[PDB]
Symmetry: C3
Subunit: 153 residues, 3 copies
């Protein structure tokens, strides 16, 4: 096509890591959901949005490591380009029961702009809350939604 | 306009049936939300997104029935009447379930068939909420969808 | 860029007031989330999507008035308009455990069509429930999803 739209959604449940001594041996004990990523909800959702607009499925097909989400994002963009697309613009909506992120937003945009090889003017990020409601409101984790518009370069 | 965008969100809450003997007669008893469809959250959301992009309201403004594919075709036909065809659609199933990947392409083929477009204009993905929220507690499933329509 | 895509999400948690007598004085007592707006999730989500498409951040950057969401929405359109954008079309999905809202949907579309200086035909509003599930299903609040397509004017 000449223009494609994609959508992404992701959640990160909060988990904790604590050291324990079992059988005289120091071992790591993980509490909460077992993550297989850095939990970067904004990049995971954004990554699913771009792959989806190009009909490439989802983040779960980028490498048949995963600890780094910018690596996954680049790999997705690499593949999107292979199909002839470049970024039109993307918009990300972080859903968290948190306040101060604006100082960090622009930094996020730049990083995303860098990995998608586009201007920062094509990347928007925002954060909003659920006003103490739901799992994000009770602070059990965070979520993120993202939309992307692809164009033929 | 020659290019339209639309969005859909849908939820299906799990419910169950069980037989009961009351007054010497067996009667069916339903537990949970009463369903009025096959519960296909992906097609319902997709339908809303397509109807939404054309400013045709939503699934509720179709038949003033249970098979979601019929609703989906009805929505596409109405979007055709206005002169649109599918640019591309992207579906995101939100459920606390494992393997659906084996059935994804089957889903894409049927959606492509109903929207009279190529399977390549259709994307379907499934993600989880990592045991959080009503989908995480497995009380039901949800789905979000976006659709881009192009002027025919 | 000739076409821009945007996304918005908003939630409004319910809160009731109750007058009391303290120190022989009457004072209003608030229960629940402290509201800072009229709680119009539809216009807030819409506002975030329009600004998000133009990479203007979010609704919380407009007026550094908040008691009226249309004011904020018209302001948002003003700024997108300054970057040379006009509405392509917008689609809004209100998520609430409520029924009778259809009779008011067209009235909403007209007001939105007015603040976005476009035709009502370019504005869609739909409503759905979560079938008694989640915080909206338990009736603790309401939510709204929004996407916007901006076109170069
Ligand atoms: Mn995930
Ligand atoms: Mn439903
Ligand atoms: Mn809010």
């Amino acid at each position: 096509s000449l223009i494609r739209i994609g959508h992404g959604f992701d959640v990160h449940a909060f988990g904790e890591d604590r050291p324990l001594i079992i059988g005289g041996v120091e071992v790591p004990y993980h509490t909460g959901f077992i993550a297989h990523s850095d939990g970067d909800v904004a990049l995971h959702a954004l990554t699913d949005a771009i792959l989806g607009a190009a009909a490439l499925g989802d983040i779960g097909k980028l490498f048949p490591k995963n600890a780094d989400s910018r690596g996954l994002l680049r790999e997705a963009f690499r593949q999107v380009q292979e199909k002839g697309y470049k970024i039109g613009n993307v918009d990300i909506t972080i859903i968290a029961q948190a306040p101060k992120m604006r100082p960090h937003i622009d930094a996020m945009r730049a990083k995303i702009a860098e990995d998608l090889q586009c201007d920062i003017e094509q990347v928007n990020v925002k954060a909003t809350t659920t006003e103490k409601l739901g799992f994000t409101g009770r602070q059990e984790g965070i979520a993120c939604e993202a939309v992307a518009l692809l164009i033929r370069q």
